[PDB]
Design a protein around this ligand. Structure first.
Ligand code: 4P3
Length: 217
């Protein structure tokens, strides 16, 4: 790995993320002023857990489609066997989507973009998943307060995906090589953007994995 190669990898990943990021930062930030009325909230509250679920499951599917596209656009992700690509997406897809949620979270009033507007966590009362939702607000909070940039997200999410210690992989070596190259890109870009600071301040593999497991449950 040279500088052109790693600087190229940084740009590939950021471009890949920007094409696949589903909802534009632009819009997300525009729509913060805009908030659900108590009539609106009470309406989502009133629904059935089943009505809710299927709506959330529509966006989850849609969002998992975008993570896969991102992964497919990752350098040398497609040159891995089918079996490995499945291992990585099946372990990491959902972790990425959670990370990707921080963007639609607004720490300044503890709301998140849902279905066109912003709302608080009480919006999801019908699901009877208060503990879980409340964590999600907390893990999205702690990242929004490091002002995670789009390139920081792209690159971090790429390493949540490309992990040589997932079991099931047949060609570990190639993955370690993909993984390592992205670490370099992350750490390089971090040095270029004077953000070396945020490493110690990110939530560990521990948290993110244990939350995503509570989520998949
Ligand atoms: C509520 N939820 C879940 O993932 C979830 C959960 F956190 C607990 C239980 C059941 C479910 Cl389906 C969920 C699903 C899709 C979305 C979602 C909405 C949109 C959208 N445009 O509204 C787009 C993509 C997605 Cl993945 C957001 C969700 O939760 C937000 C928060 F912050 F409250 F968790």
């Amino acid at each position: 790995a040279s500088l052109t190669e790693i600087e190229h990898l940084v740009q590939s990943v950021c471009k890949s993320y920007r094409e696949t990021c589903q909802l534009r930062l632009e819009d997300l930030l525009r729509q913060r002023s805009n908030i659900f009325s108590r009539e609106e909230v009470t309406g989502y509250q009133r629904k059935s857990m089943w009505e809710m679920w299927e709506r959330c499951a529509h966006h989850l599917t849609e969002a998992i489609q975008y993570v896969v596209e991102f992964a497919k656009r990752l350098s040398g992700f497609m040159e891995l066997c089918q079996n490995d690509q499945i291992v990585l997406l099946k372990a990491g897809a959902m972790e990425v989507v959670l990370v990707r949620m921080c963007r639609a979270y607004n720490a300044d009033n503890r709301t998140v973009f849902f279905e066109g507007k912003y709302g608080g966590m009480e919006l999801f009362r019908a699901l009877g998943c208060s503990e879980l939702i409340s964590s999600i607000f907390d893990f999205s909070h702690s990242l929004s307060a490091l002002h995670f940039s789009e390139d920081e997200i792209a690159l971090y999410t790429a390493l949540v995906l490309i992990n040589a210690h997932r079991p099931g992989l047949q060609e570990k070596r190639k993955v370690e090589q993909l993984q390592y190259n992205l670490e370099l890109a992350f750490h390089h870009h971090l040095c270029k953007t004077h953000r070396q600071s945020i490493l110690a301040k990110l939530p560990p593999k521990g948290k993110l994995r244990s939350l995503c497991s509570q989520h998949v449950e």
